[PDB]
Design brief:
about 140 residues, mainly alpha, about 60% helix, binds zinc ion, DNA primase
Length: about 140
């Protein structure tokens, strides 16, 4: 029994359906320290991309001996996300929620930067754009 979080859904669905890795856009330039679980998700995506067609068991075997192995095993047996008909739509929905959460963090970062350092022209336009858009169980993530 695990409560849903965005990153639990993404990592769990990917572990249970490694073919979903092909729907993930590039994550290489994201700061994993901004979002718990993002670093592990990125690792899993890259593992799937390096070995197309791998099974859940083969993906889990690749992570044996890592500090995330026990967490990946739990998520692999998580029945709450087991339904295959809705797996892809759920993955895509949660992918967009992840990026929305990063946009909120970026907006908060730019507000704090503006009070401490002022913003560049590019940053001020970025913050304005973000403001307009806004106007309109031991798993550690
Ligand atoms: Zn990493
Ligand atoms: Zn590896
Ligand atoms: Zn949603």
């Amino acid at each position: 029994q695990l409560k849903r979080t965005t990153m639990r859904i993404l990592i769990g669905l990917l572990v249970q359906n490694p073919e979903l890795a092909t729907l993930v856009p590039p994550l290489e330039n994201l700061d994993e320290n901004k979002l718990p679980g993002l670093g592990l998700f990125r690792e899993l995506v890259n593992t799937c991309l390096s070995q197309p067609g791998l099974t859940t068991g083969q993906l889990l075997e690749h992570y044996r001996g890592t500090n995330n192995a026990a967490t990946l095993e739990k998520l692999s047996m998580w029945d709450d996300i087991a339904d295959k008909n809705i797996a892809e739509q759920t993955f895509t929905d949660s992918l967009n929620h992840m990026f929305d959460s990063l946009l909120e963090l970026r907006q908060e970062e730019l507000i704090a930067r503006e009070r401490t350092h002022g913003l560049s022209n590019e940053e001020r336009l970025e913050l304005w754009t973000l403001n307009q858009e806004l106007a309109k169980d031991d798993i550690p993530f």
